[PDB]
Amino acid sequence: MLTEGISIQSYDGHTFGALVGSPAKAPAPVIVIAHEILGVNAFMRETVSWLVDQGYAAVCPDLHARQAPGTALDPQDEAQREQAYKLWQAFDMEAGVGDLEAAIRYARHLPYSNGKVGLVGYSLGGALAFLVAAKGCVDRAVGYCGVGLEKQLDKVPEVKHPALFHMGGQDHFVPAPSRQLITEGFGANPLLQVHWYEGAGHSFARTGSSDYVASAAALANERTLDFLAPLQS
Template sequence: MTGSTITIGANDGGSFSAYVARPAGAAPAPAIVVIQEIFGVNQVMRDICDWLAGEGYIAVCPDLFWRIEPGIDITDKSKAEWDKAFSLFSAFDRAHGIADIETTRAVAATLPGCTGKVGAVGYCLGGHMAYRTAAQTVIDASVGYYGVGINDALDVAGGISKPLMLHVAEKDAFVPPEAQAKVAAALGANPLVTLHNYAGQDHAFAREGGEHYDAAAAKLANSRTLDFFKTHLA
């Protein structure tokens, strides 16, 4: 499947690119905003968009690092790339990121063939931003994979008004047990929030080709994600 690139105007001026993958056929489809990891809109993110398009969704992955450096497309295969990724993570402004995600959501809702329903799914940094998206935008449903730093952003949890699912890696090196416990205590009783814990799994267990990729855990998480979107974006 071949995707395309669109340009989206930011709400405070400037513009950023987004990768778009569309399902086959002409039937109306919901959209999903795919929120990047710290490696930019790379092949992993484009493959996720293509996978979602194959499942019947219009998938849109915006370049959230454009304010720092547009067009980041790196991997997790070298120290230099990891150093670059962590520098981008440190420089990233989450308030600007949420604004750009909400702008992307609004654009996605009006793309030709979209039903108007829009979900979000994010990974790593994107998992954190998927949580914020549920709390700080009008997204219809949101899913976060191994989000980093959610425990430090629980002050916005009261804004969650639509369904949120979080996939939590029990052995996540970037999210220690006390951070996971804090998130569970704050969100576990919220009927809009579903928490799934993956025993023995480390960060990025669903990143194909990654050091901690686990096919069985990834398959389970992805099936739960698809069921979640099927329910809430119908």
């Protein structure tokens, strides 16, 4: 689902929609949400609503718009998971970062903005959140369950503002050696935090997932809100 009429234009003239949640009160910091491989779906709707309830405005851009506008896949359906994996395989990460940078610029200019913008990414969005933190577009970045972080360690010293990462300890995408590489690499830059959730799998914070772990999701989410709170006026 996207908000009708919202259109954000990127570096190369590509435009895309977004689901937008205005804040309960103005002004407010704005959180750009980088979605999973499944697009702007029920979990994104829940995430916008949650951040609005917590004193933010939120903007979830349609990152699959270069491939197919309005992707909103339900992870309960095998056919829809299959379409998501096909979209991910083809997804241009660099163009994703560009679209997120455009969404952040859009977020800064919203009429109720207090001048501060954060980014929170899940899955696909978690890996994009690290890349955006390296570019420095945002005031604070958060990434849940990003894949392939161990292949981006050269970017650790590029991070110049705080970024927080939540990672499952039983995430098959991040096996023991990868976890070790990420832990040692990220540890060199005190602007970064990486927290591991022992006993929790890849989608431990996604409501409805068979991977969901309430205790872990609760702790990660509490940490996220405490990390974002300094952006509030």
